[PDB]
Ligand binder design. Structure first.
Ligand SMILES: CCCCCCCCCC(=O)N(CCO)C[C@@H](O)[C@@H](O)[C@@H](O)[C@@H](O)CO
Ligand SMILES: CCCCCCCCCC(=O)N(CCO)C[C@@H](O)[C@@H](O)[C@@H](O)[C@@H](O)CO
Ligand SMILES: CCCCCCCCCC(=O)N(CCO)C[C@@H](O)[C@@H](O)[C@@H](O)[C@@H](O)CO
Ligand SMILES: CCCCCCCCCC(=O)N(CCO)C[C@@H](O)[C@@H](O)[C@@H](O)[C@@H](O)CO
Ligand code: NA
Ligand code: NA
Ligand code: NA
Lengths: 92, 95, 92, 95
């Protein structure tokens, strides 16, 4: 549980560092600085406008942007679910 | 204890809707103008429908730290709702 | 499980009958006929644009529309989750 | 059997993306123009992001029965994904 939350924080910072670098100059409102990146990736993780709102606009400049976001969604959504289940299981 | 979980959620929902009415009511009246409008918006935000693009990003354009309220709200309420729904299903199977 | 799926089908038809009647004349693209209603309520159940896309526009004509949709979401989302868990538990 | 579940999902994803490319490719080329565009749209539809307002409702304006493909697709894939993720967590706890 504590290790799961630690893994998620590491992945969140590494991904937000990568995203700032990859799409920061082209998409500054969403990935302009580490803070803007951490906010966008949290939004993308919850799945709110991930494609129509973020990825489809991003792919119009970077056609492979899906190689970053789709694996990010698969990894973080599974981890978040696994973490929440882990909290409930340990408390019981 | 299921009933206590639902009670905790109702308290958190009213406290948050009181806080939100005060924080964003004057600037964003269609969404947080009164306690009722606030309770509706926070239910929407809790389900995750247009939470960012639709609500938080427009709210952050006036209040840049609005994320300090909404992100912890989402983390707390979504976990509690999940925990509550699991608790109902687990207790009904045992009984 | 079979009874859960049966309860959901009854609730889906009753709600789509109610919705056709309540918002059919005012919102015909979404609730014009039982079919359009069953499609909208399935969308609302999955939570896609339930508020900004459907309920907020509907509330502008019917200010209490939330008394129908919010309890509908609470009932159907819980039942769907309970049904899917029930399938997985019975198969194991 | 986890590995078989992931295998079933991949088969369903390719079959559905083949079917969708054929059905809506000429009418909706930005979303279903090629197998790649189709696999991306169906992943989006599977996560439920703008599935109706963004994709299906525009698609139904040309193909009124499009719901016969997408609604069963959502029911099948979302259940399988949930079942797969639960299967991973259950097997890791047992081992
Ligand atoms: C799961 C973990 C998710 C963490 C999410 C962190 C979000 C941080 C967002 C943020 O702070 N900003 C980007 C907004 O998108 C910047 C501004 O809103 C504002 O904070 C600044 O101007 C200054 O106040 C900094 O001191
Ligand atoms: C635990 C979930 C609790 C959800 C509570 C939803 C409250 C709905 C609030 C409401 O009635 N309105 C706000 C929507 O504008 C409309 C009124 O102002 C008029 O009827
Ligand atoms: C969980 C259960 C969810 C059931 C969902 C059922 C959706 C039915 C939607 C539907 O069929 N239509 C509304 C579209 O919103 C009508 C048209 O698309 C079209 O079917 C008709 O014109 C004729 O073909 C009828 O024979
Ligand atoms: C099991 C989930 C599988 C998801 C598979 C996503 C495939 C992404 C498809 C893709 O590469 N593009 C489609 C997006 O337009 C862009 C290309 O056409 C160019 O690079
Ligand atoms: Na969702
Ligand atoms: Na959603
Ligand atoms: Na949306």
């Amino acid at each position: 549980v504590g290790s799961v939350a630690a893994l998620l924080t590491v992945v969140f910072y590494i991904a937000a560092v990568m995203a700032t670098n990859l799409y920061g100059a082209t998409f500054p409102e969403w990935f302009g600085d580490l803070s803007k990146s951490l906010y966008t990736l949290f939004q993308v993780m919850t799945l709110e406008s991930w494609s129509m709102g973020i990825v489809r606009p991003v792919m119009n400049v970077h056609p492979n942007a899906w190689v970053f976001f789709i694996p990010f969604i698969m990894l973080t959504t599974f981890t978040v679910l696994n973490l929440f289940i882990g909290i409930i299981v340990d408390a019981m």
